[PDB]
Design a protein around this ligand. Structure first.
Ligand SMILES: Nc1ncnc2c1ncn2[C@@H]1O[C@H](COP(=O)(O)OP(=O)(O)O)[C@@H](O)[C@H]1O
Ligand SMILES: [Mg+2]
Length: 330
């Protein structure tokens, strides 16, 4: 009843729109830079306040934003994958993090980020509803891949880390929120001093670590959480996957550290894209710690831009989409 016949126009547009959504049998794609969008459904509180759903997904790659002016104006965005409200964590995982698990076994570096406004679904995507969770699904597949004959030969051990970044400070979530320190040497290599890697022999051990870690993390909407899977051959690093649940991108309080951090990340992803010798890693603790993952022939990244579909979040949604749009730009 409040926001005009805008809801009626949106419904009429949806009834005419013939859709071609993503399914689980669609072939997995191999991208150096994979940029996705994930729309979460309206919650019970949003449905109670009569929030209009202003997002449609007519294909595996296309996202539409419905704007009132006062007549319907539809804005289109194109991504590698667009996940609608029917997409489970399992479906999202398949097309994002899952193809990057093999990368770490070939001796590469992989990164996976969940980016978007607070309440959009980043933690739900990475950690789980409480149901997995990209961290758990990646961990499970790491242990399946290392039990295979090809890789069982390599003599690989699996280590894990889990830390958060808040106000330019790193805290170890597996070692009682200890304030670690990030150092850079004369060759631009970065080390997190005091960060202990934990040896794990099963995905069940990792789940206990994530749960141990998630219990620590607190507002958790103002911090980045980074979970790492590290493959070591004989103590020598073979491969690394870093999975990050970023701080909310929406904007007295502080959001200047977050915004510079997110801007720095975009530039680092963009630079990996262009196979550049230098990227502005130093501009944030997040990019400094992940420096190693934005360089190399066999370094790959995925970003999942999570969006809240309600009319009230429209401006924040457009900011998220505009940012994700500039992440994979030649
Ligand atoms: N795709 C989804 N399907 C169902 N519920 C979701 C989905 N994404 C998010 N939610 C729910 O919405 C709420 C907020 O999500 P959350 O992951 O905490 O957001 P964020 O980390 O981006 O701030 C939670 O109760 C969560 O389970
Ligand atoms: Mg969260």
């Amino acid at each position: 009843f409040p926001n005009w016949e805008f809801a009626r126009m949106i419904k009429e547009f949806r009834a005419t729109l013939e859709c071609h959504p993503l399914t689980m049998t669609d072939p997995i794609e191999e991208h150096r830079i994979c940029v996705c969008v994930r729309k979460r459904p309206l919650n019970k509180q949003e449905l109670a306040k009569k929030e209009i759903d202003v997002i449609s997904i007519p294909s595996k790659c296309l996202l539409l934003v419905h704007e009132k002016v006062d007549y319907l104006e539809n804005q289109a965005f194109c991504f590698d994958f667009a996940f609608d409200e029917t997409a489970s964590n399992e479906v999202v995982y398949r097309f994002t993090a899952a193809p990057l698990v093999q990368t770490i076994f070939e001796g590469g570096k992989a990164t996976c980020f969940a980016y978007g406004q607070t309440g959009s679904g980043k933690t739900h995507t990475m950690g789980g509803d409480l149901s997995k969770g990209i961290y758990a699904m990646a961990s499970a597949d790491v242990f399946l891949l290392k039990n295979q004959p090809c890789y069982r030969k390599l003599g690989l051990e699996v280590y894990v880390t889990f830390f958060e970044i808040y106000n330019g400070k790193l805290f170890d979530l597996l070692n009682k929120k200890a304030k670690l320190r990030v150092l850079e040497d004369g060759k631009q290599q970065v080390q997190v001093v005091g960060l202990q890697e934990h040896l794990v022999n099963s995905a069940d051990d990792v789940i206990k670590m994530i749960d141990m870690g998630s219990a620590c993390r607190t507002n958790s909407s103002r911090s980045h959480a980074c979970f790492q899977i590290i493959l070591r051959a004989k103590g020598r690093m073979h491969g690394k996957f870093s999975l990050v649940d970023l701080a909310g991108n929406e904007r007295r309080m502080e959001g200047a550290e977050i915004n510079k951090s997110l801007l720095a990340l975009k530039e680092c992803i963009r630079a990996l894209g262009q196979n550049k010798a230098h990227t502005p890693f130093r501009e944030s603790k997040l990019t400094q710690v992940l420096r190693d993952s934005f360089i190399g022939e066999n370094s790959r990244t995925c970003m999942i831009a999570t969006i809240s579909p309600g009319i009230s979040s429209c401006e924040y949604t457009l900011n998220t989409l505009r940012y994700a749009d500039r992440v994979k730009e030649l």
